[PDB]
Amino acid sequence: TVMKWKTVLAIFLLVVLYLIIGATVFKALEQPEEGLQKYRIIQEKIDFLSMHTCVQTSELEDLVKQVVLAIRAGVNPSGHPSQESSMWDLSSSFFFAGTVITTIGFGNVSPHTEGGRIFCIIYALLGIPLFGFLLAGVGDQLGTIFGKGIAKVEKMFVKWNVSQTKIRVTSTVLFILFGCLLFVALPALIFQHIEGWSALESIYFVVITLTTIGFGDFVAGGSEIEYLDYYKPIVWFWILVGLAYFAAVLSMIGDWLR
Amino acid sequence: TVMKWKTVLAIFLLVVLYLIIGATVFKALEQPEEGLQKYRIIQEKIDFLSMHTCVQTSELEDLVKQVVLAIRAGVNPSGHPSQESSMWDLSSSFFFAGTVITTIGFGNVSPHTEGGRIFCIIYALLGIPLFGFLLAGVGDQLGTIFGKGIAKVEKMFVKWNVSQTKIRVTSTVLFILFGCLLFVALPALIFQHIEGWSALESIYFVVITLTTIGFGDFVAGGSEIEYLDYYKPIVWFWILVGLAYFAAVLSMIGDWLRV
Numbered sequence A: 001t002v003m004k005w006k007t008v009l010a011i012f013l014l015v016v017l018y019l020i021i022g023a024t025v026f027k028a029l030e031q032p033e034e035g036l037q038k039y040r041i042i043q044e045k046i047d048f049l050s051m052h053t054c055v056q057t058s059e060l061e062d063l064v065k066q067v068v069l070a071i072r073a074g075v076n077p078s079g080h081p082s083q084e085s086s087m088w089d090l091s092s093s094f095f096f097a098g099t100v101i102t103t104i105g106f107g108n109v110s111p112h113t114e115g116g117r118i119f120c121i122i123y124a125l126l127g128i129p130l131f132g133f134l135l136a137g138v139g140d141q142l143g144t145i146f147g148k149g150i151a152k153v154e155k156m157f158v159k160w161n162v163s164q165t166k167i168r169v170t171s172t173v174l175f176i177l178f179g180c181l182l183f184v185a186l187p188a189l190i191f192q193h194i195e196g197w198s199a200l201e202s203i204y205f206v207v208i209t210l211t212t213i214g215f216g217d218f219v220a221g222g223s224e225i226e227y228l229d230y231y232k233p234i235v236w237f238w239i240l241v242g243l244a245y246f247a248a249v250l251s252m253i254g255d256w257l258r
Numbered sequence B: 001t002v003m004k005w006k007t008v009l010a011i012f013l014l015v016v017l018y019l020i021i022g023a024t025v026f027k028a029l030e031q032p033e034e035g036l037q038k039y040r041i042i043q044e045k046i047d048f049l050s051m052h053t054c055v056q057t058s059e060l061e062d063l064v065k066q067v068v069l070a071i072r073a074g075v076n077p078s079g080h081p082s083q084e085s086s087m088w089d090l091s092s093s094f095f096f097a098g099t100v101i102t103t104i105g106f107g108n109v110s111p112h113t114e115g116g117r118i119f120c121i122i123y124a125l126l127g128i129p130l131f132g133f134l135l136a137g138v139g140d141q142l143g144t145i146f147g148k149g150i151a152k153v154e155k156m157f158v159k160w161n162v163s164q165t166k167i168r169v170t171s172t173v174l175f176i177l178f179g180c181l182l183f184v185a186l187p188a189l190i191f192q193h194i195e196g197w198s199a200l201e202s203i204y205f206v207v208i209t210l211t212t213i214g215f216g217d218f219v220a221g222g223s224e225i226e227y228l229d230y231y232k233p234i235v236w237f238w239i240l241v242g243l244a245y246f247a248a249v250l251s252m253i254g255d256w257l258r259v
């Protein structure tokens, strides 16, 4: 039941127009913010040069170029590093490898050396099918468990016989809402307590992570706030559970369609 | 085809084991490099302060904090901006929207405004099922044409005393290798010509892009290289072609394996 050649062209045309609409609206939303940021940085640099007689713009440019190059490495220059705080923590390495197999790819931490890149390529290629098999198995198992639970929920007592599929739709909408409430809506509050993030920033981080976009501007562990009680393993297990459960819901929806 | 509970536990233990192994070896590979980086920037800052008596460590730290705040914004400080050129042009945001639906998410181009984050969430949730349906349709279309072509060639070819399984796995291996080399090795060469990146950097970028990891350390568009017109749309079409072909090949191999 493969799609018609002309049909595929219609979906492709729709995707292309979709992307054109998106590009125009991000352009119009987002150019003023970086216009003001460019103005702010150029005015700040001019004030710094004007106020400091001793400093030379060539030396300042060389120092800023070195600092931005350092940012690529991932080490923050603003704070003095103790050097018992290590970016590649066993916990951090576990979280990074988990994101690599999970295909999130935040990007705040990444391999830099030649072997690091080669091992990252090999590790991703070998790991991704394994995680895919795990997710498919957990999704199918959870789907069966959910369907038997659905049978238990449909007691058939005081149903009020309004419609045959009325309670099927009501149960599906209430389970999906409950799952979203616990998986996406509730962790956001934990994130607000732990890191003081805004509501939009936290909900955006959770959607980006569970949708496996992984922009990396917002990451679970950053800026030395001394997280406590095994923050990296619990958040990675959280990501696995959320991705699996929604993979199950999507698979069930597809089964219903078929 | 329900899976067993016992083997799910074993698979999860295997995944956790592999994660622990990877973390232990990554830590040992990667700590010395960043140790040297921290020492290098510490000694450079100390040398700078020693050279300039007038500058005061507090003002310099404040300046560094502002510069690293500006890096988050996405505007480079090293070069003076002409302002005729803008990061959020139609081509860059076309590529960005393509990455968002494609689930690459490089992260060098991210939305900071209140409206931008909300629209990014809505745009992702709307677009991703659409791209998923397009990829499934293209994958199955490629699979069907490949199946008919392989059946036709197999029927014409190998008439006399040859194992069918051997011929089938020879054909699949040769086809996958040819497609993989043409789609991955050749663009690494184009990237080598256009940019300063080494061969390992280019192959790493291509593997990270097609596999949907999207680390963002290396991206096709960067460093004010005055990239030729419509470079972002063509690279995005190449990304679409690579993902569709690889997904189709995986779909075919999986279906045949289960059949």
Ligand SMILES: CCCCCCCCCCCCCCCCCC(=O)O[C@@H](COC(=O)CCCCCCCCCCCCCCC)COP(=O)(O)OCCN
Pocket (backbone or CB within 6 Å): A103, A125, A128, A184, A206, A207, A210, A211, A212, A243, A246, A247, B101, B102, B103, B128, B131, B132, B135, B180, B184, B207, B210, B211, B212, B243, B246, B247, B249, B250
């Ligand atoms: C609050 C909202 C909640 C959201 C709901 C949850 C969302 C759940 C998941 C939704 C997003 C989609 C998940 C995608 C899973 C990624 C798995 C994967 O393997 O990546 C892609 C497939 O992987 C590949 O295609 C890799 C291609 C081959 C790799 C080539 C690398 C080098 C090869 C050299 C040798 C080749 C070795 C093997 C050759 C077969 C498939 O994803 P996609 O492209 O379809 O995503 C686009 C639409 N979402």
Ligand SMILES: [K+]
Pocket (backbone or CB within 6 Å): A103, A104, A105, A212, A213, A214, B103, B104, B105, B212, B213, B214
């Ligand atoms: K990603």
Ligand SMILES: [K+]
Pocket (backbone or CB within 6 Å): A103, A104, A212, A213, B103, B104, B212, B213
């Ligand atoms: K992904």
Ligand SMILES: [K+]
Pocket (backbone or CB within 6 Å): A103, A104, A105, A106, A213, A214, A215, B103, B104, B105, B106, B212, B213, B214, B215
């Ligand atoms: K990513």
